[PDB]
DNA sequence: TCGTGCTGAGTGATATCTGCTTTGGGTGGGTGGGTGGGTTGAGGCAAT
DNA sequence: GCAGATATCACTCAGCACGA
């Protein structure tokens, strides 16, 4: 009676709004043509339903158990009538695949958090926002079994039900397959024609900021089924919409004796809203080519990164060169010539080392800032682990392994323990890690690039000593780093004023929005100033000095480029250009290496650096052949990196 | 038990299968010869190639006598067509041609005596699986065959443990991964044989689940007419057993999404495929993805969640001489010719190890390479050390915590010095 | 000399019933699951 | 739905005394 009335009401509502009918038709047509598979689900906006009929909206918001299933049935009937499949299949005929519903729009007081969920919100539709901490394994759940009776030659079926699968309660159906027919004929289960749906339980934790002072975070369990099975990972921020429910006897049954503990409450998820690479268009490639043709682009790209920092321009150049890397050669003998540059920074305190690390982290596609001092969380290198009691062996990947074909930005390289030093030596030398511990034998690639910072041992860099003396790592570790940079904090009055004012600006800078300086506190999920950057004295600052060539008086506004497009530039260069060494550059490479070695300990490995940087620079010029200019500029950069 | 009208007919499919085993011709019919070999006890595994089924279907359609799509039926529900193929083979089995032994055949004396007793009683049987001595396996549909005849291959298309969801249950699929655990071969009982101490009659019980309940009282017509309460006792000499192995397959490093951990899928191996999987191996295993329904009280308290597994059906494995063989130790390195000669001598491991009345002389040519940083030592070391079939590159510190030679450590869990 | 109808007695099969957990611990596992629970401290030995 | 421990009821058999 009431069920039919609500089904008719939702059918009328769907008829009124043609957008949902169009969406269902589009999903069905896409599924039919592709015969990767679109799920049977429709997203409705609570605002439209409220406008159409307030009673149904209030019922869904306050009594979902009695108002949702009718909507699902109406949508299923609409889809079935709209379906035009000429010939189904045994899998499709017996499949238990109704059409599910999901909700968007504006919620009232029902937009809560895991802490605010109390007993007064049960049996109501709510929207919970938080952080995922746990994610159980994906498991199949039985909802229909189809059997075959050979004697009578007829297919029988049976439906199961569980508390976590239906909003409306029914008598539990134990998972025991029927074995004999009502007439007594023996049955055989047809496994291919049954219906199993996935099941996953996740735990959402309150956002740390919202947590009241002196209170531990609270969490609520969520159950997801079918298509919404693998959509979240631990640590992600999500906005889950579902029906708050209570399950189990909760000690009310005579078997239990606690008589104080309460019932178990979870959320039946309806949808999850989440809270790398940019697909290049046709004209973005034209723009990148336009910049490449300009015969000054190297300076522009170098100084676009970290524009705030004063000085240290050669470091920015080298960091860009590292980001774009060099071609990696794989010889037929299995030999693997390294093609990834490495950089190490050593200098006195307060030289923006952490700022450079942050900027490379922001501009790099991949990066992990696992500090070398007791890297709690993710270890620097892989190391198997076992449980305290169960002894569950498992290979936990470290920072180096988690940066394959990317970058790892180590911090405070001078705080490393002997274990980390020994691990890192092997990792860089071999580029791969082979674990042979706890009965586990495996090999994991570690091809990547390493940038690290290391303070001196006495707290200040001494010029009279070699860099290998101001740092206390063995030659084995330092030799792996292709380029070593030594930077000192020099005091210049004008520089002091500039740094002071730049740092001061932020403090007086405010959170615009509330009485200036007082107690301080996505719309959708489915989804030429663009290239160049307008000059900003607040941020760029020193970038102007860069084009001025150390002249403060110089007012040459530079042609800086926004970071978002610079990431696209690096992406396009790294994924499309494979430069090949050329004789013209190679004469100068040989001559420069010979001059370095025989005339004012330089090692043969520095030759590898010249070729690597020549190819890397040739990649900047968007050319498939390394030219004399690339070799000369790489040689000059190496000369600076060796001799001041 | 409401009934549905599925668009599948099993009588027609069985007739097609029976015709397939007697008409296909890749020499007489291929599968007729294969069965003839089995009847002589020379073969104990019949492998049905779905490519052959597709070829037979296309040949029939070309003639105009179109029939049902058997290939799609097999993959959609594979656990049922094993029985159909076994029944067809039993029906069309040929008589042996080579003289068989028949001497030490427990399930030939048992059956002969059972026939004699039944004939004598009636004048005044056994389950089909018991007599079977062959195993039926399915070979997936190769991509080349599918593209040749304009079809899509779902079984052969490799997947990952992540992509094996509940929708694939009951189908023939392929999984790509690395084996990480294997178990010892154990006998899984298929048909139990009992003996009544009173009748002299044998009672056979089929077991097709993880658990079974033994019989106690005889059900023979002799114990019924006389209503004697004879006791049945198990006899392992007449039962039927099949080798059983349980393994684990894990995802490769190339299939785990960022921020996710590898998953593992259990594999069950029955019949002759046992021992074809070993730890630490990359394989392409095709099998039937089936659930394992619980039994007893566990079923009620377990819930609707189903523990699944894979029934392996096919496994595919992812596999001046002196001066010349010296300058080729690391062609990339330039100098150090004599050193390279020495490393070649090391590779050969030249010795004819001599053991007389107990004396043992080492047969290993140790070598060291000192010098200064810059000369090609480490590159030489890794090249020379990759050349050999077996090698281990490590620093002077050792392999992780344990140093070079050996070390005894307290067990984290068992607290036993290991 | 003896044959048979009535009786008390005792098993056999079958009716209801409780129970379907149970349990602390890693040679029971983690595809059995945390609403079924597990919260040391001294002493010996390898590494160094 | 399933196995095990337990108690209930109904049916049939060997002895007994009398009458043939
Ligand atoms: N060239 C520069 N231009 C502007 N600010 C700079 C420059 N060099 C250093 N600074 C200032 O130095 C301050 C200190 O930076 P940071 O804490 O990263 O120093 P660090 O040398 O890496 O530190 P540590 O010595 O602790 O390892 C930053 O706030 C930055 O403003
Ligand atoms: N004869 C040569 N031919 C080719 N490359 C050479 C030669 N001599 C030296 N090199 C280069 O010298 C560089 C030295 O780096 P390498 O990895 O060999 O370190 P190493 O000093 O030998 O190692 P270690 O001291 O740690 O044992 C390598 O890139 C190698 O290519
Ligand atoms: Mg710092
Ligand atoms: Mg070395
Ligand atoms: Zn008997």
DSSP string, A256-322: ----S---EEEEEEEEEEE-------HHHHHHHHHHHHSTTHHHHHHHHSS-SS-S-HHHHHHHHHH
CA B166 to mean position of chain CA atoms:
22
For A77, residues 6+ apart whose C-beta sits below 8 A from its C-beta are: A7, A11
Q: Where are the alpha helices (DSSP H) in B124-225?
A: 128-131, 143-148, 221-225
- Which ligand sits nearest to residue B230's alpha carbon? 5
For residue A202, CA distances in Å to A117, A157, A167, A199, A267 come to: 17, 32, 19, 10, 10
Q: Nearest-CA neighbor of B275 among B248, B249, B245, B313?
A: B245
Contact present, A281 and A565 (Cβ < 8 Å):
no
Q: Do A140 and B306 touch (CB under 8 A)?
A: yes
Q: Do A93 and B4 touch (CB under 8 A)?
A: yes
Residue A557's SS3 state is coil
Q: Nearest-CA neighbor of B333 among A335, A278, A509, A410?
A: A335
d(CA A432, CA A400): 10
- Which ligand sits nearest to residue A479's alpha carbon? 2
C-alpha of residue A130 to centroid of ligand 1, in Å: 35
d(CA A426, CA A415): 18
Contact present, B170 and B306 (Cβ < 8 Å):
no
For B157, residues 6+ apart whose C-beta sits below 8 A from its C-beta are: B143, B173, B174
d(CA B246, CA B141): 25
Q: Considering only alpha carbons, which residue of chain B is nearest residue A158? A: B1
Experiment type: cryo-EM
B371: annotated binding-site residue?
Answer: no
Our CA-based measurement puts residue A366 at a distance from the nearest CA of chain B, in whole angstroms, of 11
B381 Cα nearest atom in ligand 2: 27
Angle at A485 between CA A480 and CA A489, to 5 degrees: 150
- What are phi and psi for residue A156, nearest 5 degrees? -105, 160
Our CA-based measurement puts residue A539 at a distance from the nearest CA of chain B, in whole angstroms, of 34
For A170, residues 6+ apart whose C-beta sits below 8 A from its C-beta are: A161
Tokens 């709209």, residue located: A82
Contacts of A475 in chain B (CB under 8 A): 373
CA B363 to mean position of chain CA atoms:
41
C-alpha of residue B144 to centroid of ligand 1, in Å: 62
Our CA-based measurement puts residue B398 at a distance from the nearest CA of chain A, in whole angstroms, of 9
Number of residues that make up chain A: 644
Q: Do A141 and B305 touch (CB under 8 A)?
A: yes
Q: Is B389 on the interface with A (CB under 8 A)?
A: no
Contacts of A425 in chain B (CB under 8 A): 395
Through-space distance between the first and last CA atoms of chain A, rounded to whole angstroms: 89
Closest nucleotide to the alpha carbon of A176, via C1': D1
The shortest CB-CB distance from A155 to any of B3, B76, B303 is to B3
- As a whole number of Å, the CA-based R_g of chain A is 32
| Fold of the A1-110 domain | mini-chromosome maintenance (MCM) complex, chain A, domain 1 (3.30.1640)
Q: Tell me the residue ranges of DSSP E strands in B252-307.
A: 264-270, 281-291
State if residue B374 touches ligand 2 by the CB under 6 angstroms criterion: yes
Q: Do B4 and A94 touch (CB under 8 A)?
A: yes
What is the 3-state composition of chain B as percent helix, strand, coil, each rounded to the nearest 5?
Answer: 30, 20, 50
Q: Where are the alpha helices (DSSP H) in B99-213?
A: 106-123, 128-131, 143-148
Contact present, A272 and A228 (Cβ < 8 Å):
yes
- What are phi and psi for residue A22, nearest 5 degrees? -65, -40
Closest residue by Cα to atom 27, ligand 1, is A349
Q: Nearest-CA neighbor of A233 among A274, A277, A270?
A: A274
Q: Give the residue ranges with Cβ < 7 A from strand C.
A: A 136-137, 139, 201, 248, 250-251, 261-265, 389-391; B 264-266, 296-298, 300-302, 305, 307-309, 403, 407-408, 410, 413-414, 417
A142 strand-pairing partners:
A196
Task: Mutate one of A40, A183, A192 to test the B interface: name it (highest B CB count within 10 A).
Answer: A192
Task: Mutate one of A140, A386, A468 to test the B interface: name it (highest B CB count within 10 A).
Answer: A140
Q: Is B303 on the interface with A (CB under 8 A)?
A: yes
Q: Is residue A128 left, alpha or beta, with left meaning phi > 0 and alpha meaning psi from -120 to 50?
A: beta
Tokens 């056979």, residue located: B204
CA A171 to mean position of chain CA atoms:
43
Our CA-based measurement puts residue B382 at a distance from the nearest CA of chain A, in whole angstroms, of 8
B305 strand-pairing partners:
A141
B310 strand-pairing partners:
B267, B289
Query: What angle, 0 to 180 degrees and rounded to 10, lies between the N-to-C axes of helices A282-293 and A297-304?
Result: 110
Burial of B317 (0-12, 13-18, 19+ CB in 10 A): exposed
- Which ligand sits nearest to residue A355's alpha carbon? 1
* Resolution of the entry in angstroms: 3.5
Angle at B141 between CA B134 and CA A141, to 5 degrees: 85
d(CA A438, CA A162): 42
Residue-by-residue DSSP string for B71-90:
HHHHHHS-TTHHHHHHHHHH
For ligand 4, an ion, list residues with CB under 5 A.
Answer: B 378
Q: Is B378 on the interface with A (CB under 8 A)?
A: yes
* Neighbour tally for B113: CB within 10 Å: 13
- What are phi and psi for residue A149, nearest 5 degrees? -105, 105
C-alpha of residue A170 to centroid of ligand 3, in Å: 63
Query: What's the CA B2/C1' D6 distance, rounded, in angstroms?
Result: 40
Strand C footprint nucleotides (protein C-beta < 7 Å): 19-21, 26-27, 30-35, 38, 44, 46-48
C-alpha of residue A137 to centroid of ligand 5, in Å: 51
Provide the b/e sequence for A597-629 (b: ≥16 CB within 10 Å).
Answer: eeeeeeeeebbbbbbbbbbbbbbbbbbeebbbb
B378: annotated binding-site residue?
Answer: yes
State if residue B378 touches ligand 2 by the CB under 6 angstroms criterion: yes
Closest nucleotide to the alpha carbon of B216, via C1': D3
Q: Do B291 and A335 touch (CB under 8 A)?
A: no
């Amino acid at each position: 009676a009431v069920f039919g009335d609500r089904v008719r009401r939702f059918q009328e509502f769907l008829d009124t709004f043609t957008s949902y009918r169009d969406s269902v038709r589009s999903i069905q047509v896409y599924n039919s043509n592709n015969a990767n598979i679109l799920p049977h689900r429709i997203i409705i906006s609570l605002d439209d339903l409220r406008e159409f009929d307030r009673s149904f909206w209030s019922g869904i918001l306050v009594e979902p158990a009695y108002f949702i299933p009718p909507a699902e049935k109406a949508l299923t009937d609409l889809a079935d009538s709209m379906d035009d499949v000429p010939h189904p299949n045994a899998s499709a005929v017996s499949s238990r695949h109704p059409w599910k519903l999901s909700f968007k729009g504006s919620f009232g007081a029902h937009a809560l958090s895991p802490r605010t969920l109390t007993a007064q919100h049960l049996n109501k539709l709510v929207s919970v926002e938080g952080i995922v901490t746990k994610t159980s394994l994906v498991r199949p759940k039985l909802i229909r079994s189809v059997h075959y009776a050979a004697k009578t030659g007829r297919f029988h079926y049976r439906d199961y039900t569980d508390a976590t699968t239906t909003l409306t309660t029914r008598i539990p159906t134990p998972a025991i397959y029927p074995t004999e027919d009502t007439e007594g004929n023996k049955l055989t289960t047809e496994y291919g024609y049954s219906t199993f749906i996935d099941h996953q339980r996740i735990t959402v934790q309150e956002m740390p900021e919202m947590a009241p002072a002196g209170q531990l975070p609270r969490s609520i369990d969520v159950i997801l089924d079918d298509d919404l099975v693998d959509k979240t990972k631990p640590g992600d921020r999500v906005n889950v919409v579902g029906v708050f429910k209570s399950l189990g006897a909760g000690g009310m049954n005579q078997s239990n004796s606690n008589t104080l503990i309460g019932f178990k409450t979870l959320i039946l998820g309806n949808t999850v809203y989440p809270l790398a690479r940019q697909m290049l268009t046709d004209f973005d490639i034209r723009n990148i080519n336009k910049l490449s043709k300009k015969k000054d682009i190297f300076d522009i790209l170098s100084q676009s990164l970290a524009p705030s920092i004063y000085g240290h321009d050669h470091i920015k150049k080298a960091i860009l060169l590292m980001l774009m890397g060099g071609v990696e050669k794989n010889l037929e003998n299995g030999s693997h010539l390294r093609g990834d540059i490495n950089i190490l920074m050593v200098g006195d305190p307060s030289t923006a080392k952490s700022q450079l690390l942050r900027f490379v982290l922001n501009t790099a596609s991949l990066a992990i800032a696992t500090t070398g001092r007791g890297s709690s969380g993710v270890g620097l290198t892989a190391a198997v682990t076992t449980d305290r009691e169960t002894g569950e062996r498992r290979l936990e990947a470290g920072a180096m392994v988690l940066a394959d074909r990317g970058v790892v930005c180590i911090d405070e390289f001078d705080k490393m323990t002997d274990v980390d030093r020994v691990a890192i030596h092997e990792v860089m030398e071999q580029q791969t890690v082979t674990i042979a511990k706890a009965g586990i034998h495996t090999t994991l690639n570690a091809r990547c690039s390493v940038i690290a910072a290391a303070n001196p041992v006495f707290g200040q860099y001494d010029v009279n000593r070699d860099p290998h003396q101001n740092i206390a790592l063995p030659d084995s570790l330092l030799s792996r780093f292709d380029l070593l940079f030594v930077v000192t904090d020099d005091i210049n009055e004008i520089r002091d004023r500039s740094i002071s004012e730049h740092v001061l600006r932020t403090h007086r800078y405010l959170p615009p929005g509330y009485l200036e300086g007082e107690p301080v506190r996505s719309l959708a999920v489915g989804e030429e100033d663009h290239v160049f950057e307008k000059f900003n004295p607040l941020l760029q600052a020193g970038a102007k000095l860069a084009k001025n060539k150390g002249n403060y008086n110089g007012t040459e506004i530079p042609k800086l480029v926004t970071i978002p497009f610079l990431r696209k530039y690096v992406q396009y260069a790294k994924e499309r250009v494979i430069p090949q060494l050329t004789q013209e550059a190679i004469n100068v490479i040989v001559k420069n290496y010979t001059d370095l070695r025989n005339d004012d300990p330089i090692t043969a490995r520095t030759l590898e650096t010249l070729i690597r940087l020549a190819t890397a620079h040739a990649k900047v010029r968007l050319s498939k052949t390394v030219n004399k200019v690339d070799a000369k500029v790489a040689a000059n950069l190496l000369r600076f990196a060796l001799l001041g | 038990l409401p009934s549905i009208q599925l668009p599948v007919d099993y009588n027609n499919l069985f007739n097609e299968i029976t015709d397939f085993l007697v008409t296909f011709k890749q020499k007489g019919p291929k599968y007729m010869a294969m069965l003839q070999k089995v009847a002589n006890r020379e073969l104990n595994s019949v492998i049905i190639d779905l490519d052959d089924i597709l070829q037979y279907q296309n040949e029939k359609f070309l003639q105009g006598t179109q029939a049902d799509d058997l290939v799609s039926a097999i993959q959609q529900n594979a656990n049922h067509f094993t029985e159909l193929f076994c029944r067809a083979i039993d029906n069309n089995m040929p008589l042996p041609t080579k003289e068989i032994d028949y001497k030490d055949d427990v399930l030939d004396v048992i059956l002969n005596q059972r026939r004699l007793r039944n004939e004598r009683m009636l004048s005044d049987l056994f389950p089909p699986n018991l007599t079977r001595r062959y195993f039926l396996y399915f070979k997936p549909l190769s991509q080349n065959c599918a593209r040749r005849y304009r079809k899509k291959a779902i079984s052969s298309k490799p997947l990952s443990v992540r992509q094996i969801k509940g929708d694939f249950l009951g189908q023939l699929i392929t999984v790509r991964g690395i084996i990480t655990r294997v178990s010892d071969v154990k006998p899984a009982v298929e048909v139990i044989a009992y003996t009544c101490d009173q009748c002299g009659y044998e009672v056979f019980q089929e077991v097709n689940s993880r658990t079974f309940t033994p019989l106690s009282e005889c059900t023979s017509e002799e114990c019924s007419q006389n209503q004697t309460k004879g006791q049945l006792f198990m006899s392992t000499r007449a039962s039927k057993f099949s080798a059983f192995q349980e393994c684990k397959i894990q995802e490769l490093s190339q299939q785990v999404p960022v921020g996710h951990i590898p998953r593992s899928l259990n594999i069950h191996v029955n019949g002759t495929l046992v021992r074809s999987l070993s730890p630490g191996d990359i394989v392409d295993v095709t099998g039937i993805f089936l659930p394992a329904p619980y039994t007893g009280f566990k079923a009620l308290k377990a819930g609707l969640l189903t523990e699944t597994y894979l029934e392996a059906q096919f496994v595919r494995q992812h596999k001046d001489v002196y001066n010349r063989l010296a300058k080729s130790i690391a062609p990339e390195i330039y100098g150090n010719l004599d050193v390279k000669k020495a490393l070649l001598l090391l590779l050969v491991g030249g010795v004819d190890k001599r053991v007389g009345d107990g004396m043992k002389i080492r047969g290993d040519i140790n070598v060291c390479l000192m010098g200064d940083p810059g000369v090609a030592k480490s590159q030489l070391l890794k090249a020379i050390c990759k050349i050999s079939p077996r090698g281990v590159y490590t620093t002077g510190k050792g392999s992780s915590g344990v140093g070079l030679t050996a070390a005894v450590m307290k067990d984290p869990v068992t607290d036993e010095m290991i």
